[PDB]
Paper text:
The major class of these adhesive pili (or fimbriae) is assembled via the classical, alternative and archaic chaperone-usher (CU) pathways. The biogenesis of CU fibres requires a periplasmic chaperone and outer membrane assembly platform termed the usher. Here, we report atomic-resolution insight into the structure and biogenesis of Acinetobacter baumannii Csu and Escherichia coli ECP pili assembled via the archaic and alternative pathways, respectively, whilst also highlighting some important deviations from the classical assembly mechanism. The non-classical chaperones, unlike their classical counterparts, maintain subunits in a substantially unfolded state by utilising a register-shifted DSC and a distinct subunit C-terminal carboxylate anchor.
ECP is composed of the EcpA and EcpD subunits, which are assembled using two periplasmic chaperones, EcpB and EcpE, and the EcpC usher. We next crystallized free EcpB and determined its structure using I-SIRAS phasing to 2.4 Å resolution. EcpB consists of the two characteristic Ig-like domains as seen in all other chaperones and has an overall boomerang-like shape. Whereas the β-sheet packing in D2 in subunit-bound CsuC is almost orthogonal, in EcpB, the two β-sheets pack nearly parallel to each other, at an angle of just 15–30°. Domain 2 of EcpB does not possess helix 1, common in classical chaperones, or helices 1 and 2, characteristic for archaic chaperones. Instead, it has a short helix located in a long loop between β-strands C2 and D2. In contrast, the domain orientation in subunit-free conformations can be varied significantly, as seen in the structure of EcpB, which implies that a substantial rearrangement in the relative domain orientation occurs during the formation of the chaperone-subunit complex.
Numbering used by the authors: 0 to 96, 115 to 202
The structure:
């Protein structure tokens, strides 16, 4: 396949622009087209919805010839409202030596980051998605000597960790509020 970088990218509230590097690691050059769709949500039961205006989210370049064993920067620009709402977009990449879909999250310009860790459950009690993670011993020793989990936690949703043993005092929880890393436990 083609290397697009992160499968979900985050434009945090102090930022309206973002770059992704794409690498073509094969002998062939490639004809890439790139397209954007807003989404009701980033989840599987989400659906494409309309941008309020066609300059809400723009990228360059939308077409390029990427030669063999070479990389290029694609830039993304947000010009929609600066409000308390988080927005979700799909980046659709067409590849010719494959149609791959990745996620862009525009965190609310008016961010209110909050969370609760109670009874082993993380709950997002703010208005912007959190990137949550645990690391430490495994719950089922069938899974091995070290365990980690990584998830996106949308506003209002909860998550228990199911691989890492967070009840053991060597099990750790932390999360990202935009660009700030917060040691939860």
């Amino acid at each position: 396949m083609l290397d697009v970088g992160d499968i979900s990218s985050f434009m945090n509230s102090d930022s309206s622009t973002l770059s992704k590097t794409i690498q073509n690691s094969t002998d062939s050059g490639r004809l890439i087209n790139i397209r954007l769709e807003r989404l009701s949500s980033p989840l599987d039961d989400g659906q494409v919805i309309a941008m309020d205006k066609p300059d809400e989210l723009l990228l360059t370049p939308a077409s390029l010839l990427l030669p063999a064993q070479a990389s290029e920067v694609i830039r993304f620009f947000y010009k929609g409202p600066a409000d308390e709402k988080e927005r979700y977009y799909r980046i659709v990449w067409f590849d010719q030596a494959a149609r791959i879909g990745t996620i862009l999250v525009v965190a609310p310009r008016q961010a209110n980051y909050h969370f609760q860790y109670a009874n082993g459950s993380l709950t997002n009690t703010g208005n912007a998605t959190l990137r949550i993670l645990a690391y430490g011993p495994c719950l089922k020793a069938a899974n091995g000597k070290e365990c980690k989990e990584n998830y996106y936690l949308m506003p209002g949703k909860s998550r228990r960790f199911t691989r890492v043993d967070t009840a053991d005092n060597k099990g750790r929880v932390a999360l990202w509020q935009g660009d700030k890393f917060i040691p939860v436990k």
